[PDB]
Every structure is written in structure tokens, then in C-alpha cells.
Symmetry: D2
Subunit: 131 residues, 4 copies
């Protein structure tokens, strides 16, 4: 047993290849072998969102604050709220972020395959970023 106390895991920023706009990532856990699962709290500023991407064993999102958008490829752009729970299937191309006027914060949970829990792709355009 070990405890990572509050404020002991520093906030980091979203790298510009992977996110449009201002995103802060607050690491929560990365579970050692034989566990595969990792999680972090991600906070998007108004207008911010991830580039298109996929997850090898999928990801679950648990919204914890604010109001944001999310779309799987060829689906519609959905609105998500605190308490909402999202599932993206393995390989499903998708994106998620804040709404244009409000921040959003979510817990993102995903299992790694190699040492690889995400595949990044093209950014989400302004044209694509609408509802």
C-alpha cells in the first residue's frame, strides 16, 4: 500500500501536438505490472480539446466538473456533464474537450497495451468543433 497525497503530483500542461488550446493534466495514477490501467484528471479551458485519437483498450471518461463536448468518428458531437460516464471502444477514433464557453474537467481512465495507452492523430478543426 502507498498513498499519493493531495498536491504531491504536480500539474502539467497539454503538449500542442495533442491538444488545441489550453489543457492542464493532473496525473493521478499509473499502475505497475501486472496491472495495465492509468488515470489522470484533465482540465480543458473554454475552446480547448484533444486532437483526434484512439485507445488500444479504450478509455472511460468520468466528468467531474463543467461542461464539454465529445465525438466519435461519424457520430454527433455530444454534450457531457459532471457525473456523466463515457466509454470509447478499443480503436474508436474520437475527441473530447471543453465547450466553447465553459471549461470541462474529467477523469480519464485507460489500460496500456505496450507502454502505450493512446494513438494521436490530426487536430480537431474549427469546422469540426461545432454542435
Amino acid at each position: 500500500m502507498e498513498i499519493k497525497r493531495v498536491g504531491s503530483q504536480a500539474s502539467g500542461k497539454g503538449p500542442a501536438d495533442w491538444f488545441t488550446g489550453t489543457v492542464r493534466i493532473d496525473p493521478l495514477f499509473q499502475a505497475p505490472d501486472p496491472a495495465l490501467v492509468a488515470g489522470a484528471s484533465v482540465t480543458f479551458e473554454p475552446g480547448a480539446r484533444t486532437a483526434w485519437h484512439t485507445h488500444p483498450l479504450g478509455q472511460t471518461l468520468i466528468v467531474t466538473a463543467g461542461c464539454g463536448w465529445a465525438q466519435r468518428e461519424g457520430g454527433a458531437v455530444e454534450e457531457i456533464h459532471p457525473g456523466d460516464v463515457v466509454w470509447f471502444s478499443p480503436g474508436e477514433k474520437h475527441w473530447h474537450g471543453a465547450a466553447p464557453t465553459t471549461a470541462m474537467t474529467h477523469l480519464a481512465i485507460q489500460e496500456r497495451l505496450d507502454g502505450k495507452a493512446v494513438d494521436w492523430m490530426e487536430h480537431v478543426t474549427d469546422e469540426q468543433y461545432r454542435r
Copy 2:
């Protein structure tokens, strides 16, 4: 892409075989193959706690509300707070719960191994629940 909207998953109660005291279990997500991760929000009334148990692939707690206790065997009873992230190793024997006078809620995340994500053991006695 699937969304479980807030309020669409019924609250449930912890069965007396697995818990001392009153415990509410709010499921959040589970599975499906090939992914293995499951999660729930677990709320303990003051004085309530899990029985001793283990997890075949480990467990992460993210404390979301109140103030609880937790102890691995051989360890001291720790006090945990919101924003604390707690990890128990695969096979590690332990219990978690509320403190005597305050409720505690946490996000419990674990991976399943051939069907189960917990092995239940004896109750935590009143003498053991002391710190």
C-alpha cells in the same frame, strides 16, 4: 461511443457479508473484453468499512468526499482525504472505510482477472478499527 448519463445507474447497498455498517455503491463503469477495468463510487457512512479483502490485479482509490481510514495488513491505519490517490498491490490484504465520525466516498478502480476483481475475507473487528 456510449454515454451513461448522470442518474441512469441505480444506487445499491453493500451486502453485510462484505461490509460492516451502511455502505452505498454507485456503479460507474465496467469491462467489456478485451478491456478489464471496472469502477464505482463507494460511500461509507461513519463507522462503516469493507471486510478484509484482496484484489487479484490491484486497486486504486481516488477519494472524492469526506474522510476515511485504510490499512494493509502489517501496516498502520492511515487517514485518507479527498484528492488522495491510494494503491493496493495485487494480492495485498487490506480494508478501507469511513472514519468513526465522518463519511467518506471514493472512486474505486480495479481490473478483473478471470471474472472477479475481489476476494473477500473476514470482517474488520471493532478492535482492529482503531488507529
Copy 3:
């Protein structure tokens, strides 16, 4: 500067005359004079709710967990979600609590008028609760 610290204030049961069902009250603050504002976190088990009541200077609810219901007399029963802000106008007879199968938690903020912040009335019947 006074800080209380999480875990430091003990939880309480909502008295039977003011609540139907199982309610937990986690006190937060009570400002001294000349300020008038008080706040508590209130947690309603499924199907639990306040009696009908009024607040002499209105009340603001900030839902923090779960899914609840609320109504003023002659109005529709509405769902309240985490992140929602609910305002009850001064003297308006109302009730608020859990949805019938999901718990919920809210921050209740109200100002006291002559050393009182609520007036308690009859319980909300099972019919009024649904209808």
C-alpha cells in the same frame, strides 16, 4: 483566518421531523455577525427528502454528487444534477432531496433572518414526491 480542515467536523443524521428517509448532514460553516450566511453539505439516500419548508432569505443549492429532485409548491418536480445551481426565492414553500433510486448530495447555502434560517412544515407525501 480560520480553517476547519476536512474530517474535522462530525457528520449528523437529519432529524425525523425535517426529513423523510435517511439523510446525512455534514456541517461546513456558520458565519458570525454581522455576516448571516451558513452552509452545509446534505446527502440524501435514495427516496429521501426534506419536509416542505421555507427560508426567510432564500437558499442556494449547489449539487455536488448524484441525481436529485426538487419542487416548489404548484411547480413541476425537477431533476437537479451535479454542477447545477438551484435558487429558492425567499418564503417560497419547497422541498428537495434524492431521486427515488439514486442518492444525491448538495451544498445548501442560506442566510438567517432573526437567528433562524428555515421554517419547517409538513412532510412531503409519497404522492407529492412523484407527482
Copy 4:
């Protein structure tokens, strides 16, 4: 009567005269007369904090995420953690904000006295922010 659903109030940025660093203000509520209370959710990025200021009827903080620092003048700087409640007296000169490397979110609740909730004084210097 009224319910402001989550993503319906646009996030705002803290003005440069009142904050050091990047700060987001999410408005929550302002009670109309004869009530005097108002509330916002304020999110400080790592290193960001308010200027020195006072409140005419005092202020209540309820930390909701992350990890932050606070100091009334003549006092030590204190850590505040999620679920902590902080009280500042009317007229008490003080500041609050993020820790140097972790962001922080809190609920700020204060009452207005003839239409003002705060009086703004000088910025907090890098030297005062240490200790």
C-alpha cells in the same frame, strides 16, 4: 423557483489588476435583494493567486479540487486542500491561490454590503508568496 443547469453560465478570466497569473472565474449565483450572498467557482493555475484584498462582510472558501495557498496579513501561508473550509473576517486583509506547482479550485461565498463584495489592494509579491 430557479435552476441554472451546469454549462449555462460562461467562464470568465480573472482581470489583471486583481490576479497574478492565470485565473478562471466560473460564476455560480448572486441572490437578489433582500438577500446579500453571492458565489463563484474560482480556479487558479499553478502559481496564480489573488491580489491582497478584504471583504466587507467576510468570505467563506470551500476547496473543491487541487491544492492551494492562503494567507491573511501578519500570518503564515497555509495549505488548503479539497474539502477544507476557510473563514476570513470582515475587513481582514488576505490572499488566496494555487500552490506553486499545483492548480487549485475553490468555491468562494461572500456577502455584499451596499453592492460590493470586495475591496482590492496591492498584488502579492513573489517574495510574499513564498512564506
